[PDB]
Amino acid sequence: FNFTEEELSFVLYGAIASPEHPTDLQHAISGISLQLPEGLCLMQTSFGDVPHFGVFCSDFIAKGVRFGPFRGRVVNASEVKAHRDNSRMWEIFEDGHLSHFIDGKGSGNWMSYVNCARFPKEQNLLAVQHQGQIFYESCRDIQRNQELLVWYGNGYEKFLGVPMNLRVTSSGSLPATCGARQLSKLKRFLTTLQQFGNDISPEIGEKVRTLVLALVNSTVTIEEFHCKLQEATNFPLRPFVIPFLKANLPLLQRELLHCARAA
Amino acid sequence: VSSVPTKLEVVAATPTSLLISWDAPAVTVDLYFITYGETGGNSPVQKFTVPGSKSTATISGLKPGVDYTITVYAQYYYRGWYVGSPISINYRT
């Protein structure tokens, strides 16, 4: 694979502009009765002649407003296939452990169209589990024409962006590497990883930037990447990362590859 | 034009759980947030929701003896989604 840093930055940090002013962010699913509340709207744009929706704020949303509960099929933990994205699933915990997933795909409820945050600056929603269900809570004042984008809130034990557990008010098990919202988790891991590097050092952050791009381009194998990254950053990754990358890296590559050329 | 609730009252039910009550504000309410956490404590503050239909909730799993700050406030829609200002009380079970 021979991708440029700019086309990587596009998939991790970019957005498509519409005929208007507001832009759609990229959780560009579909790689090859809404009951929508007041103040919100569903917004289609086109990407590769493939329809792509997003939930936008038509008016105003104050910080601390909570929407939900998320609605969808109940997927038992065993029947979720591997090498798949599962763009619209949430992990449901009971008593400290993974119970089941809740699949919003094809629900037709408006919340299943809210895309994920790939990094915090574009994030205005927090995913929050209460009782058995998922809610989205605004973490910022949401202004008109700004897109609603969610990520796993605190109350989820996370490592560099990826959630491992339901943060305790004690239990001990990680969700298996094959699960919900995998491509979004991968993006969130890579961006968080990049920011993590920059905070240590400019030279170290630049090393990671090239090291990640080389990984995305399969120039370097994951275990090769893992070692060199730990060498360059002087910081140990959790064991889940290698199988996580082996499972989900080919999703970012497939999407990255999926780009139209001008006309 | 008012959003803040009134007459919030707290009663102990078990040494670790309270029954709280309030009466709705002027505005039409979607959610009430209920919030509890140790007064003057470095402990985090917890919050759940009850629908506008309800004007009572039960808080549970509290430390007996320790006083908590309970807070309720309304989430409404008025030319935008807003969360109002809260009513507060402190109470040791």
Author numbering:
A (entry chain A): 2 to 33, 53 to 189, 195 to 288
B (entry chain E): 1 to 93
Publication excerpt:
Prdm14 is a sequence-specific transcriptional regulator that plays key roles in promoting primordial germ cell (PGC) specification and safeguarding pluripotency of embryonic stem cells (ESCs). As a member of the PRDM family, Prdm14 contains both a zinc-finger array, responsible for sequence-dependent DNA binding, and a PR domain that is related to the SET domain (Su(var)3–9, Enhancer-of-zeste and Trithorax). Our study identified the ETO family co-repressor Mtgr1 as a new regulator of mESC identity, which facilitates molecular functions of Prdm14 through direct binding to its pre-SET/SET region.
The addition of Mb(S4) readily led to crystallization of Prdm14-linker-Mtgr1, and we determined its structure to a resolution of 3.06 Å through single wavelength anomalous diffraction (SAD) phasing using selenomethionine-labeled crystals. The Prdm14 SET domain in our structure has a total of nine β-strands (β1-β9) arranged in three antiparallel β-sheets with a short 310 helix (η1) inserted between β6 and β7. The Mtgr1-Prdm14 interaction interface buries 2180 Å2, a large interface but still within the observed range for high-affinity protein–protein interaction interfaces with a low nanomolar KD value. The substantial interaction interface between the pre-SET region and Mtgr1 (35% of the interface) rationalizes the importance of the pre-SET region in the Prdm14-Mtgr1 interaction. Arg105 located at the N-terminal end of Mtgr1 αA sits in a pocket formed by Ser290, Met292, Cys319 and Tyr339 of Prdm14 and its guanidinium moiety makes hydrogen bonds with the side chains of all of these residues. Lys109 in Mtgr1 forms a salt bridge with Glu294 from β5 of the Prdm14 SET domain.
